[PDB]
Structure 1
Amino acid sequence: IIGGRESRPHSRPYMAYLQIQSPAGQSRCGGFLVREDFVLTAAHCWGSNINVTLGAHNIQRRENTQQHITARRAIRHPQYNQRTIQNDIMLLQLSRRVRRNRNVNPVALPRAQEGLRPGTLCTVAGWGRVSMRRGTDTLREVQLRVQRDRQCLRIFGSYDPRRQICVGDRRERKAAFKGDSGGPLLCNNVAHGIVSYGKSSGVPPEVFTRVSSFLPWIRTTMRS
């Protein structure tokens, strides 16, 4: 997270830290708990073996609130396009359910086909880097402002307003960064987006997967 602040510890109990493939440091992403046995994250964060950490603040310490569970299944959206980075969403079925408490619980998802008005303030959080030079051991967050689709539509070639969201005022040095992928975009306490991609510079506006466009796929994957 660029330009954010450290989150109050354990105030976002749905946040997940993903350790993708061995050794310990092959690749990392964020994610969020949507049910006691399912984690939603970005499809581009896919890996052969994924270790999910829940209940964390400082990921470099053995905290008693932490729960480590390996993903039993990593279900990428069937239409995920790695080239255009379209349909960048994936469900992680945990090998075992989380033991639900004040430090570990699901986030509310939006209703299907639920849009978002440009100018709306949303919060994004993660353990990604804060700059090109340094990272963070603890959870951070930042408030980003939703942009008109029209704006990303002329910056990113494969942008699709119906499945993605344009986020971030270019006039502020606030954005998600490397390692924050898969993290939630919470607008009015509901997980509306998933960190996906942007300019390498980290210069807004960036692109988030629009969660409400995938509800039927979400409900079918978790039910079945």
Structure 2
Amino acid sequence: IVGGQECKDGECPWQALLINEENEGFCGGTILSEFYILTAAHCLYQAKRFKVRVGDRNTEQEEGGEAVHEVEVVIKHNRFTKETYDFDIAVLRLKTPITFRMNVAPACLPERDWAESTLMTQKTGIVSGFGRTHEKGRQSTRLKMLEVPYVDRNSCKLSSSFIITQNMFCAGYDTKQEDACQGDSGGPHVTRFKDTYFVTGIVSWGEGCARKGKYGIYTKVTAFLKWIDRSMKT
């Protein structure tokens, strides 16, 4: 997260952290239910074996509300491709359920049609993670959140040197040095509506971080809702 503010006690309970064998956070996650985590498809290649930590805001000082969970099942969208990063989405089934508490709560899943004409038509969404605070910088030890505006679909594509498929959408700023970054991938992108937060995107990728004329690219969650329910059902 380049810029933004740190998630204050309670502000980002649906955040989830994917850690490797060395307890180093390498990707983000979104709590969907006591058993299911949502994350970027490409994050699965970042480490051979990983667990999921929840209820953490400071990676170096136990807030006593943290909790590690072993991943039991990994459901990667079969159409994912490291070539264009299309279908960058995957669900995780946890061996043990999540015990909701102060900084551990699920983010709601909306209905496609409503989400598209109301949530995605809002002015801004929220993105958060333990990612880098600068492009060449290092991982953050403090959980962060950034308010990123929705970027017009046209401008979006015109600014991307890479292709922007129908499963992605731009967000962030044209020049303002605020944007998600490495480590935030697979992280949450939620839109707020009447004091209720709805999942609306997965942190996917981007050309650099906060680079002028470049936006942040998120997986269009409303395009995999039917797929996300099937995966959870079984």
Identify the residue that residue 164 of structure 1 maps to in structure 2. Answer: 168
Identify the residue that residue 153 of structure 1 maps to in structure 2. Answer: 157
Identify the residue that residue 206 of structure 1 maps to in structure 2. Answer: 216
The 8 Å contact of residues 128 and 188 in structure 2, kept in 1 or not, is answered as yes
Could you give the per-residue CA deviations for residues 149-187 of structure 1, whole angstroms, max 9, x where no partner exists?
111222243212x32111122131110011000111111
Could you give the per-residue CA deviations for residues 39-60 of structure 1, whole angstroms, max 9, x where no partner exists?
0010111043211101111122
Which piece of structure 1 moves more, 99-108 or 169-178? Answer: 99-108
SS at match of 2:112: coil
The 1:24–1:101 alpha-carbon spacing in structure 2 relative to 1, beyond 3 Å, is closer
Identify the residue that residue 36 of structure 2 maps to in structure 1. Answer: 38
Could you give the per-residue CA deviations for residues 175-219 of structure 1, whole angstroms, max 9, x where no partner exists?
001100011111122110111001124423121001111011101
Matched residues, number: 220
SS at match of 1:142: strand
Whether 1:136 aligns to 2:146 is: no
Q: TM-score, normalised by structure 1?
A: 0.92
Over 4 Å off, 4+ runs = none
What are structure 2's unaligned runs of at least 5 residues?
none
SS at match of 2:109: coil
The 8 Å contact of residues 14 and 30 in structure 2, kept in 1 or not, is answered as yes
SS at match of 1:212: helix
Identify the residue that residue 76 of structure 2 maps to in structure 1. Answer: 76
The 8 Å contact of residues 180 and 209 in structure 2, kept in 1 or not, is answered as no
Distance 2:161 2:232 in 1: 32
Q: TM-score, normalised by structure 2?
A: 0.88
Identify the residue that residue 190 of structure 2 maps to in structure 1. Answer: 186
Which piece of structure 1 moves more, 138-147 or 127-136? Answer: 127-136
RMSD: 1.6
Which piece of structure 1 moves more, 90-99 or 148-157? Answer: 148-157
Identify the residue that residue 128 of structure 2 maps to in structure 1. Answer: 125
Could you give the per-residue CA deviations for residues 51-95 of structure 1, whole angstroms, max 9, x where no partner exists?
110111112223310111011112111111111000001101111
What are structure 1's unaligned runs of at least 5 residues?
none
Distance 1:164 1:24 in 2: 30
SS at match of 2:32: strand
Distance 1:152 1:103 in 2: 33
Q: Pairwise mapping of residues 57-136 of structure 1 onto structure 2 (< 5 A)?
A: 57-113=57-113, 114-115=115-116, 116-117=120-121, 120-131=123-134, 132-136=136-140
Deviation at 1:3, TM superposition (A): 1.3
Distance 2:203 2:215 in 1: 12
Aligned residues: percent identity? 28
Identify the residue that residue 215 of structure 1 maps to in structure 2. Answer: 225
Distance 1:58 1:102 in 2: 14
Could you give the per-residue CA deviations for residues 128-155 of structure 1, whole angstroms, max 9, x where no partner exists?
1101234321111111111111112222
Distance 2:90 2:146 in 1: 23
The 8 Å contact of residues 31 and 182 in structure 1, kept in 2 or not, is answered as yes
Distance 1:159 1:143 in 2: 22
